[PDB]
A paper describes a structure:
Dominantly inherited mutations in MAPT, the microtubule-associated protein tau gene, give rise to cases of FTD and parkinsonism linked to chromosome 17. Here, we used cryo-electron microscopy to determine the structures of tau filaments from the brains of human MAPT mutants V337M and R406W. Both amino acid substitutions gave rise to tau filaments with the Alzheimer fold, which consisted of paired helical filaments in all V337M and R406W cases and of straight filaments in two V337M cases. V337 lies inside the ordered core of the Alzheimer fold, whereas R406 lies outside it.
Author numbering:
A (entry chain A), B (entry chain E), C (entry chain F), D (entry chain B), E (entry chain D), F (entry chain C): 304 to 380
The structure:
C-alpha cells in the first residue's frame, strides 16, 4: 500500500506598481478627548488589545505591494 | 492499493497598476469625544480588541496591489 | 484499487488598472461624541471587537487591485 | 507500506514598485487628551496591550513592498 | 433768566448672592479644526476683532454680581 | 442770567457675595488645529485684534463682584 505525493506548485506571478509622481499630501488631525473607566481587566492566551487610544497615522508607501502565500502539506497515518 | 497525488498548480498572474500622478490629498479631521465605562473585562484565546479609540489614518500607497494565495494539501489514512 | 489524482490549474489572469491622474481629494470630518456603558465584558476563541470608536480613514491607493486565490486539496481514506 | 513525499515548490515571483518622485507630505496632528482608569490589570500567555496612548506615525517607505511565505510540512505516523 | 438744577439721586441698592457650596464642575472640550482665508484685511476707528479662534473658557465666580450705573448731566446754552 | 448746578449723587450700594465652599473644578480641553492665511493686514486708530488663536482660560474668582460707575458732567456756553 504505497503513497506517492508530489507538490510542485509553480508561481511566476508579479505584483507590480508604477507611479510617476506621488505627493502633496496633508494630514491635519484636529485633536480629541478620550476617557475609559474600568474596574478589572483580565487577559490570557494571545490577546491583542488597545484601550483609550488617540492615534494618527500617515502611511505613504511609494511601493505598497504585498503578497502572502502559505503552503501547508499535512500527512497523517 | 496505491495512491498517486500530483499537485502542479501554475500561476502566471499579474496584479498591476499604473498611475501617472497621485496626490493633492487632504485629511483634516475635526476632533471628537469618546467615553467608555466598564466594570469587568475578560478575554481569552486569540481576542483582538479596541476600546475607546479616536484614530485617524491616511494611507496613500502609490502601489496598493495585494495578492493572497493559500495552498493546503491534507492527507489522512 | 488505485487512486490517481492530478491537480494542474493554470492561471494567466491579470488584474490591472490604469489611471492618468488621481487626486484633489479632501476628507474633512466634523467631529463627534460617542459613549458606551458596560457592566461585564467577556470574550473567547478568536473574537475581534471594537467598542466606543470614533475613527476616520482616507485610503487613496493609486493601485488598489487585489486578488485572492485559495487551493484546497483534501484526501480521506 | 512505503511513503514517498516530494515538496518542490518553485517561486519566480516579483513584488515590485517604481515611483518617479515621492514627497511633499505633511503630518500636523493637533493634540489630544486621553484618560484611563483601572483598579486591577492582569495579563498572561502572550498578551500584547496598549493602554492610554496618544501616538502619531508618519511612514513614507519609498519601497513598501512586502512578501510573506510560509511552508509547513507536517508528518505523523 | 435763572437756571437752578439739582441732581440728588440716592441709591441704597444691594446686588447680593448667597450660595452654600459651588462646585463639581467639568469642562472637557473635544477639540476642533478652524481655517480662515483672506486676501486683504483693513480696520480703523475702534474695531475689535477675532479671526480664526478656537477657545475655551471656564468661569466659576463664587461671586458673579455686577452693577453698572451711569450718570450723565449735560448742559448747553 | 445766573446758572446754579448741584450734583450731589449719594451711593450706599453694596455688591456682595457669600459662598461657603467653591471648588472641585476641572478644565480639560482636548486640543485643536487653527490655520489663518492673509495677504495684507492693515490697522489704525485703536484697533484690538486676535488672529489665529487657540486659547484656554479658567477663571475661578471666589469674589467676582464688579461695579462700574461713570459720572460725566458737561457744560457748554
Amino acid at each position: 500500500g504505497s503513497v506517492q505525493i508530489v507538490y510542485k506548485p509553480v508561481d511566476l506571478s508579479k505584483v507590480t506598481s508604477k507611479c510617476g509622481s506621488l505627493g502633496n499630501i496633508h494630514h491635519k488631525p484636529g485633536g480629541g478627548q478620550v476617557e475609559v473607566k474600568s474596574e478589572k481587566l483580565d487577559f490570557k492566551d494571545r490577546v491583542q488589545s488597545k484601550i483609550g487610544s488617540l492615534d494618527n497615522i500617515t502611511h505613504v508607501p511609494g511601493g505598497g505591494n504585498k503578497k502572502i502565500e502559505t503552503h501547508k502539506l499535512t500527512f497523517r497515518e
